[PDB]
Amino acid sequence: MDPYYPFDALDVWEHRRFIVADSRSFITPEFPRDFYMSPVFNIPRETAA
């Protein structure tokens, strides 16, 4: 279970005043992934019907 990627890698040195045609990054957390738990919606005890 790995998502597909077209290219492998690059390594870019980025000067701080020299950002031109700007881009952004992606944020992943610090804790290990056992803690980002499953999406849970339980059925309630009472129902509409």
Partner: protein
């Protein structure tokens, strides 16, 4: 209408006798509405007739949602991406969960769309983006729509649901993010709520869900992986039904 139904013991005046109907109509002539209309958009002779007016709209949009979600997701999809967010090298293993995590969400989003009250649904973005489109078939209420939402189709308007834990709404405000193959995101112009600071689909533990005046909506996942939905092919709102809907939900701007 009480005593003609109380002395006759008619519990509901659609079970009123045909002479007992029209003799009241010979007395008071404004009752031809709630007795002789084929499908009135307001229900005749019920207490929650205004409430049952609302709950249909809560129903009829969810089928317009639910049969449109199946439409763009008919078979095995190719979604590749729509935004620009670059990775670190061990960050891809987070999406290794998002492969596994994925299909339980789309139930529980629609479960939560069921799970809200419709009175609490009209404060969300999809219930007003349709009103920005039913006014286009008029300024809807509370003026949450910005001055530049009615300019392009590139001005979307998002809601935010929690991905992990419980699948819960993480907004008060529809957060309207202007979207440009690829296209990078951009906010609009501008008492403190936590999640309202980020771009749509920018980070983990966020489901992003935007809509338009064109009513072609987005479902934005973290990592650029998003796709349009033609909900305009599934909104079946009859205009004489919808014209009592909009007038109760529009505001005449000066």
């Amino acid at each position: 209408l009480t005593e003609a139904c109380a002395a006759e013991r008619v519990v509901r005046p659609h079970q009123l006798s045909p002479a007992a109907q029209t003799a009241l109509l010979r007395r008071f002539p404004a009752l031809e509405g709630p007795l002789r209309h084929p499908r009135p958009v307001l229900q005749p002779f019920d207490i929650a007739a205004e409430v049952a007016f609302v709950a249909r709209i809560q129903i009829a949009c969810l089928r317009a949602l639910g049969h449109s979600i199946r439409a763009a997701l008919q078979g095995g999809p190719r979604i590749f991406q729509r935004l620009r967010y670059d990775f670190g090298p061990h960050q891809s293993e987070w999406l290794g969960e998002v492969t596994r995590r994925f299909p339980v969400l789309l139930e529980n989003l629609m479960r939560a769309l069921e799970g809200t009250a419709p009175d609490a649904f009209f404060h969300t973005a999809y219930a007003l983006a349709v009103l920005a489109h039913l006014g286009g078939q008029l300024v809807p209420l509370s003026d949450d729509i910005p001055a530049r939402f009615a300019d392009s189709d590139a001005h979307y308007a998002f809601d935010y649901y929690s991905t992990s834990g419980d699948t819960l709404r993480l907004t008060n405000r529809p957060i309207a993010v202007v979207i440009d193959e690829q296209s990078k995101c951009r906010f609009m112009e501008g008492p403190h709520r936590v999640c309202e600071q980020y771009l749509p689909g920018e980070s983990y533990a966020y489901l992003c869900l935007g809509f338009n005046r064109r009513l072609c909506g987005l479902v934005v996942f973290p990592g650029g992986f998003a796709f349009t939905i033609n909900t305009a092919a599934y909104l079946s709102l009859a205009d004489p039904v919808a014209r009592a809907v909009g007038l109760r939900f529009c505001r005449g701007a000066a």
